[PDB]
From a paper:
Antifreeze proteins (AFPs) inhibit ice growth by adsorbing onto specific ice planes. To probe the molecular mechanisms responsible for AFP activity, we here characterized the antifreeze activity and crystal structure of TisAFP7 from the snow mold fungus Typhula ishikariensis.
The crystal structure of TisAFP7 was determined at 1.54 Å resolution by a molecular replacement method. The refined TisAFP7 structure exhibited the root-mean–squared deviation (RMSD) of 0.37 Å and 0.34 Å from Cα atoms of TisAFP6 and TisAFP8, respectively, reflecting high sequence identities shared by the isoforms. Analysis of the TisAFP7 crystal structure revealed a bound-water network arranged in a zigzag pattern on the surface of the protein’s ice-binding site (IBS). Among the approximately 54 waters molecules on IBS, six water molecules were aligned in a small trough formed by the inward-facing hydrophobic residues (Val22, Val213, Val195, Val177, Leu150, and Val126) at the β-sheet region of IBS. The interval between water molecules 3 and 6 was 14.51 Å, which closely matched that between the water molecules in a prism ice plane (4.6 Å and 14.7 Å). To survey the bound water structure in the IBS loop region in detail, we next compared the structure of TisAFP7 with those of TisAFP6 and TisAFP8. In all these isoforms, 12 water molecules in corresponding positions formed a zigzag-pattern network with branches, shown by red spheres in Fig. 6a. The average distance between the comprising water molecules and the nearest carbon atom of the interior aromatic side chain was 3.4 Å, which implies that these water molecules were constrained to engage in hydrophobic interactions with the Phe43 side chain.
Author numbering: 1 to 223
Write the structure that this text describes.
């Protein structure tokens, strides 16, 4: 049940892929790669980077995986151009899907809900002021098309019920994404603009932002 998948292509190789900046207030805990392009590695800030021997990737104690930037040694720039391309394809694929199963459902107030598999369209901002559940089997899909901003309120959490997988949940957000302090998010975020994860928040999924990503001692676990 649910809509056809949004293939991420090589964007699915990153916990965080951004185009303009990635910032962190230590100590973030990222499991997976962090890539930035076409901005240079100087737009990865707060990571206390160490450039590795080849000059093609760097490391941070805040990242289990490699960081890469557009200015790093061949072949890292080419890798990242293809990843950024694949992110753009993915975002457009998800944003342009027709025939939603849910239209303006709950006026975009997801607190206390249990969301069944489907394509969801809101011509609005979406938010949750209370915990909510995404409920379906390990093979069910969700696409959340959001024309406005996406938020998740401080300390609030998204629960997976029924065997639902984060990698099967796609948030396609045109507006800014703000995950408030201590909140726990589930899903892949295909963001047209900025994404922010505030102090002690967590996300199981990926952050694929066409502008900036801002972390504040945040946990990002690739799914």
């Amino acid at each position: 049940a649910g809509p056809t998948a949004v293939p991420l292509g090589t964007a699915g190789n990153y916990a965080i892929l951004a185009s303009t900046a990635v910032s962190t207030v230590p100590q973030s805990a990222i499991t997976g790669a962090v890539g930035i392009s076409p901005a240079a590695g100087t737009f990865l800030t707060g990571f206390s980077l160490t450039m590795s021997g080849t000059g093609t990737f760097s490391t941070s104690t805040q990242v289990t995986g490699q960081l890469t930037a557009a200015d790093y040694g061949t072949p890292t720039p080419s890798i990242l151009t293809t990843a950024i391309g694949d992110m753009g394809t993915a975002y457009t694929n998800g944003a342009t899907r027709s025939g939603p199963d849910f239209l303006e459902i709950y006026t975009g107030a997801l607190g206390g809900t249990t969301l069944l598999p489907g394509l969801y369209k809101w011509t609005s901002s979406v938010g949750a002021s209370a915990d909510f559940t995404i409920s379906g089997t390990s093979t069910d899909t969700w696409i959340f098309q959001i024309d406005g901003t996406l938020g998740l309120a401080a300390g609030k959490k998204i629960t997976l019920a029924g065997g639902a997988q984060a990698k099967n949940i796609i948030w396609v957000v045109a507006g800014a994404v703000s995950i408030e302090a201590g909140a726990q998010f589930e899903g892949v975020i295909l963001a047209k603009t900025a994404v922010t994860l505030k102090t002690g928040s967590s996300l199981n999924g990926r952050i694929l932002a066409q502008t900036s990503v801002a972390l504040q001692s945040a946990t990002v676990v690739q799914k």
